Design a protein around this nucleic acid. Structure first.
Ligand code: CL
Ligand code: CL
Ligand code: MG
Ligand code: MG
Ligand code: MG
Ligand code: MG
Ligand code: MG
Ligand code: MG
Ligand code: MG
Ligand code: NA
Ligand code: NA
Ligand code: NA
Ligand code: NA
Ligand code: NA
Ligand code: NA
Ligand code: SR
Ligand code: SR
Ligand code: SR
Ligand code: SR
Ligand code: SR
Ligand code: SR
Ligand code: SR
Ligand code: SR
Ligand code: SR
Lengths: 160, 154, 140, 95, 186
RNA sequence: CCUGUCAAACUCCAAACUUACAGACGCUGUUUGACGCGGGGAUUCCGGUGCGCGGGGU
RNA sequence: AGUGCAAGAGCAAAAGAUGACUUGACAGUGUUCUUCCCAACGAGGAACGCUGACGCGAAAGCGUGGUCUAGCGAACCAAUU
RNA sequence: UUAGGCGGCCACAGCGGUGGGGUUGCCUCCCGUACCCAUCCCGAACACGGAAGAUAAGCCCACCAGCGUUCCAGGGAGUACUGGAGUGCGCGAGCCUCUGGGAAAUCCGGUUCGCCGCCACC
């Protein structure tokens, strides 16, 4: 289905699994990536990806982006390069669809999304001053698969 | 002592606000009242902040106005020094004007109508869709600004 | 100081956990005072469905009735370290347990303005072994 | 609502804050009021008997005599005047 | 203690000195409480009224100041208890107090106990207290017959300091007697 | 220990705000009689829109 | 934890557990609120009084059913006191 | 209050800890079961009677902030949110200005190791 159906925030927060059922499983396979044993302070550079508009990101978008995003870093830095990217958000908001007529319209659970207020960090990478351009390119790809426009901001990087 | 001036009509304005205005003895657009400055009186103007023009006038202007627009409690009688003196515990406009500002008496306490029915601002005002800060005419004013208007509404 | 601190026994409970009694007799003989039945809670697959029903008995010995029983009781047992309670109590087994504690203990067992005993005034495993040991028998 | 019972949607008003749990002091379950005195109606979650209809929490009434040991406070719901029977345990002297 | 959600009992309950649940029932009557409390060596009998900041004591009576009138005996027995009661009963009679409800505190409603024996004295003093006759001890044990016949089982004095060997429950009568006297400085 | 996130049917917190009663000012009423009380006669019980807050539904 | 049963709420020298005694789940008549916010409307419901009789307790006191909010029904007709 | 009884507020009072304190005084632990009373077994408790001993508990007194809690300073923050107004901006979700209010988390620094009432009493 189109993201148009669930990109804005207009329903009440809907996440009480204790009342909701048939909630589809997350398509996300890893929130921690790269060398997840090292640390964030172990790196000079810390570039995160910031969402410019508050929205909802269906897990299919997170994974779709996170994938092609990280997949780049794996390519340009090796399946064991010296980096560690992270996706801090999680798909809590449950999404329904009324699939009859308008009678008894409450839908049936079909997905999960992550509410991300504008200005927040969807992703946060940690790399060495060299691969800083491979991470920026790794985000240029990722922000093409989520709905909002974004900013690639450096949290620690005087090397420029 | 502040000069309250309704600059926006009644249609569509909340009722609790309009009721406040009428409480402050002001019933029509362009009507003006001289309100003290207490906590109670503050709450009211604050609440009317958007359909009014207010501030403290210069003794000078306050006079210019009282002269031109003050009225008895009933009648056409012009409120001029003589009138003022023959009925008010004062001796002339300036005398009265000073007390109002010093907040010692009230147009009513004297036998004057709480309202000073002004005339449309000559040359027009700075608009009723924005405050004074945004370049409009609504809200609190500069003792000079307030005058600029009241003056213009002789 | 040493006097109001030197230990003593408050109660010695003798109890036989059975599960369905005829065992009372022996305790009445061996202790010197009547026994008391024991019930339980929760159903047990081991045909122990009836909640409130005789399962065992016991007897609380105080003062002489206790000592006199211990003079013979203690000898019949081989005391060990891992057989002591952090509060200076020991059980061995027909079970026989002994509750030891310093003088002003009533402060906690009374009704009016009772109080729990400060960790300090609490008897210690060590202080326990000592006192006891110092009365006809060995430790270890 | 979904049901029209007295306690409908009264989870909030009829429940003590954690540290106010358990039994309440007797000093106020015995407080003696004088006819005419203004009092604030507020149910004590910890107290069971002598409660007025929840809908009246927050009302400030005027003791107009008592029935038994309980009081007969006068209040005004919207525009209709009503005589509420409540026990001291659920009352506080105004001012 | 643990955290915010924690609940610490009312002070007087931690201390374990006041039984609020029972207290309330008491406070209801509206009548003053005839507080009866024991002590190893003593026995007190206060008459309390309710107040804006806390209970008020309009009339007490301690077994200690029981000697103040001529008591050379111990101060923690039935004879003692009764008397102390009748003493407070009188003082209270001197404050305008006419009726009260026995507040035996955390003690026990045991038959013939000093408390009921304390309650019996305040009644005799003129006060009006809801009681149960057959719960009170027999006039003699109130006197000290139970104790006198104990020293009969002598061989060793019942007391340390010499009040007397055989003890004088008569003294009980002597003191009680002295209380019904109008003069007596209360 | 360190680290990454949530809640219409969670809450150690907590507004703005709404709300009971009273006082004050304002306003109003005592020939325009308010507040309140009793009686006669209704109409009405298809609503709509803007805005704020919503719940459902792409 | 337990407290019969939804959920939310109340409760710890108790409203929970045990023991014993007891049968107030009694008769009758009211006040108030609710039912129906405001604001009229029945049955039903609840809190709170009074009279009579009981139960327990040393006593204050507690018991008009089960801790609170669901478990309910007009006339006509029939039976019964 | 050189140690007590009854309380109100019901953690600023909790939790944990250190130090001091008692010859006919107080409170206790304590000593003891003939009686009132008592334990589904125990004078443990409850109840009764009494001082040989003790200040080790308790309790009273002084003090400690590590945990919990109350309030306060500064920082966060006039930030989040928000009552009123706008021919202000944005495709839009939404944002902004003016006016009146205004947090929470957390951090650092103070406070807090109870306060007050009546009665009795070297
Ligand atoms: Cl009601
Ligand atoms: Cl006592
Ligand atoms: Mg005129
Ligand atoms: Mg022109
Ligand atoms: Mg214009
Ligand atoms: Mg709610
Ligand atoms: Mg029939
Ligand atoms: Mg010491
Ligand atoms: Mg537009
Ligand atoms: Na259908
Ligand atoms: Na409470
Ligand atoms: Na309609
Ligand atoms: Na009815
Ligand atoms: Na049995
Ligand atoms: Na001590
Ligand atoms: Sr919607
Ligand atoms: Sr159809
Ligand atoms: Sr995009
Ligand atoms: Sr509302
Ligand atoms: Sr009930
Ligand atoms: Sr003993
Ligand atoms: Sr448009
Ligand atoms: Sr669009
Ligand atoms: Sr401010």
């Amino acid at each position: 289905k189109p993201a148009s159906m669930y990109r804005d925030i207009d329903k009440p927060a809907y996440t009480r699994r204790e009342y909701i059922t048939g909630i589809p499983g997350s398509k996300i396979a890893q929130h921690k990536m790269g060398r997840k044993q090292k640390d964030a302070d172990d790196y000079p550079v810390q570039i995160s990806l910031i969402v410019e508009e508050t929205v909802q990101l269906r897990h299919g978008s997170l994974e779709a982006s996170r994938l092609s995003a990280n997949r780049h870093l794996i390519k340009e830095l090796g399946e064991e390069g010296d980096y560690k990217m992270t996706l801090r958000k999680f798909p809590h908001q449950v999404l329904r669809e009324n699939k009859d007529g308008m009678r008894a319209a409450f839908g049936k659970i079909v997905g999960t999304a992550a509410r991300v207020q504008a200005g927040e960090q969807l992703f946060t990478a940690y790399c060495n001053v060299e691969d800083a351009e491979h991470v920026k390119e790794a985000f240029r790809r990722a922000y093409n698969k989520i709905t909002p426009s974004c900013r690639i901001k450096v949290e620690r990087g005087e090397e420029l | 002592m502040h000069a309250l001036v309704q600059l926006r009509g009644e249609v569509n304005m909340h009722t609790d606000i309009q009721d406040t205005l009428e409480m402050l003895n002001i019933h029509h657009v362009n009507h003006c009242t001289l309100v003290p400055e207490t906590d109670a009186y503050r709450g009211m103007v604050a609440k009317v902040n958007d359909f009014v023009a207010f501030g403290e006038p210069s003794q000078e202007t306050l006079e210019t106005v009282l002269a031109t627009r003050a009225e008895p409690l009933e009648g056409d009688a012009d409120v001029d020094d003589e009138w003022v003196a023959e009925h008010t515990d004062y001796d002339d406009i300036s005398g009265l004007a000073f007390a109002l500002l010093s907040e010692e008496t009230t147009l009513r306490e004297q036998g004057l109508s709480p309202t000073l029915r002004l005339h449309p601002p000559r040359g027009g005002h700075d608009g009723v869709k924005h405050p004074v800060k945004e370049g409009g005419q609504l809200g609190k004013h500069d003792t000079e600004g307030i005058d600029d208007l009241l003056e213009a509404m002789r | 100081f040493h006097e109001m601190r030197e230990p003593r026994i408050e109660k010695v409970v003798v109890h036989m956990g059975i599960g369905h009694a005829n065992a009372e007799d022996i305790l009445g003989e061996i202790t010197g005072q009547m026994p008391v039945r024991t019930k339980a809670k929760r159903t047990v697959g081991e045909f122990d469905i009836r909640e409130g029903d005789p399962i065992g008995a016991k007897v609380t010995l105080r003062d002489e009735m206790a000592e006199e029983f211990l003079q013979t009781a203690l000898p019949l047992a081989e005391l060990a370290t891992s057989q002591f309670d952090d509060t200076g109590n020991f059980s061995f087994g027909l079970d026989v347990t002994v509750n030891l504690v310093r003088p002003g203990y009533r402060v906690a067992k009374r009704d009016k303005a009772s109080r729990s005993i400060p960790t300090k005034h609490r008897l210690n495993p060590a202080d326990a072994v000592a006192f006891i040991e110092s009365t006809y028998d060995v430790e270890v | 609502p979904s049901s029209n019972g007295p306690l409908e949607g009264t989870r909030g008003k009829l429940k003590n804050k954690p540290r106010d749990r358990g039994t309440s002091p007797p000093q106020r379950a015995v407080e003696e009021f004088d006819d005419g005195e203004k009092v604030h109606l507020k149910i004590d979650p910890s107290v069971p008997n002598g409660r007025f209809h929840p809908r009246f929490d927050g009302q400030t009434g005027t003791v107009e005599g008592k029935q038994g040991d309980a009081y007969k406070v006068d209040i005004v719901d919207g525009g209709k005047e009503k005589t509420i029977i409540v026990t001291a345990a659920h009352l506080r002297r105004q001012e | 203690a643990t955290g915010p959600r924690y609940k610490v009992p009312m002070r007087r309950r931690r201390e374990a000195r006041t039984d609020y649940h029972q207290r309330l029932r008491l406070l209801k009557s509206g009548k003053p409480r005839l507080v009866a409390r024991k002590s190893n060596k003593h026995v007190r009998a206060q008459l309390v009224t309710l107040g804006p900041n806390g209970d008020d004591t309009l009339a007490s009576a301690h077994s200690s100041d029981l000697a103040e009138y001529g008591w050379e005996a111990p101060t923690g027995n039935m004879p003692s208890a009764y008397l102390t009661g009748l003493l407070a009963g009188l003082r209270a009679q001197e404050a305008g107090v006419e009726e009260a409800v026995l507040d035996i505190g955390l003690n026990s409603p045991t038959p013939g106990s000093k408390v009921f024996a304390i309650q019996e004295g305040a009644i005799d003093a003129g006060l009006d207290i809801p009681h149960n006759d057959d719960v009170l001890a027999d006039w003699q044990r109130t006197r000290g017959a139970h104790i006198a016949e104990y020293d009969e089982q002598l061989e060793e004095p019942l007391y340390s300091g010499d009040f007397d060997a055989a003890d004088l429950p008569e003294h009980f009568d002597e003191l009680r007697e002295t209380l019904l006297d109008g003069d007596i400085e209360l």
